[PDB]
Amino acid sequence: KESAAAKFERQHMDSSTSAASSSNYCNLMMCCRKMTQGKCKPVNTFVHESLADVKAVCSQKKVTCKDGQTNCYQSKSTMRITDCRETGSSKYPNCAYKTTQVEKHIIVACGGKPSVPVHFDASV
Amino acid sequence: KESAAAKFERQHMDSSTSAASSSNYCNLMMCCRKMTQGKCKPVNTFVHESLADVKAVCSQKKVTCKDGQTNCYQSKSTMRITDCRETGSSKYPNCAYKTTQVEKHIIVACGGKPSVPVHFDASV
């Protein structure tokens, strides 16, 4: 049972100098998208192009995945993405990430039917 | 059990959001602090001062609670806070919030032993 004090802290406390900062984007997103449960996912990329443009990659340039599987595709154009990588000081359950906004081609694995993105393989 | 397609969206898509902008603080925080589950909590305030400072409010000016309860306190000084308000175009489970930074006196209810904040009542 969550205690009242912990509830107040969860719902109302965000002690900081500039919490709304974009340097904080990854810390908040990785938390929100549930990638910090039990351990910090060490690296994760978020894509900012439309969901339609990303799905479109599944019929663009075919490439081999980093793991040898052969169902990966590389986007024809660069896309705006946010790279999230643990800081040299992040320790669960206080995961910490460095936010890096860049534009690069993305490589995703496509599967299912219709064939759609099911895994983020890499950015180049 | 989440579909592969959906997992990719959760872990890698962020196309409908001013991403790393300050305007996005509330959307990410309400999500991260779990106030958007089963229903979007319509209104919520986050305090940026230190936990000690907020706890210290429990021993400042007594004021009545909005609900008639008597364990409410008002901070002697203003505190930097953020107001998160569900926007007209928000529809669960796609909760959208408006972020507004202000510096005001806060009013919290205190409980337990030792007496610590257990409810955010308002800001004045």
What is this structure's SSE topology?
The structure is a homodimer of 124-residue chains.
Chain A: H1 4-12, H2 25-32, E1 43-47, H3 51-56, E2 61-63, E3 72-74, E4 79-86, E5 97-104, E6 106-111, E7 116-123
Antiparallel strand pairs in A: 1-4, 2-3, 3-6, 4-5, 6-7
GO biological process, one term (chains A, B): defense response to Gram-positive bacterium
Organism (chains A, B): Bos taurus (Bovine)
Enzyme class (chains A, B): lyase
- Helix content range of chain A: 10-25%
Number of strands of chain A: 7
Q: What's the total helix number of chain A?
A: 3
Strand coverage percent of chain A = 25-35%
- In quaternary terms, these chains amount to homodimer
Number of separate domains of chain A? 1
- For the termini of chain A, the CA-CA separation is 46 Å
Major sheet of chain A? 4 strands, antiparallel
Spatial order of the strands forming the largest sheet of chain A: 2-3-6-7
- Taking all Cα atoms into account, the compactness measure Rg of chain A is 17 Å
Order of helices and strands of chain A: HHEHEEEEEE
At the fourth level of CATH, the homologous superfamily of chain A is Ribonuclease A-like domain
Silhouette of chain A:
elongated
Which architecture of chain A per CATH? Answer: Roll
Label the structural class of chain A: alpha+beta
Function (chains A, B): This enzyme hydrolyzes both single- and double-stranded RNA.
Main location (chains A, B): secreted
Keywords (chains A, B): Allosteric enzyme, Disulfide bond, Endonuclease, Hydrolase, Lyase, Nuclease, Secreted, Signal
GO molecular function (chains A, B): identical protein binding; lyase activity; nucleic acid binding; ribonuclease A activity; RNA nuclease activity
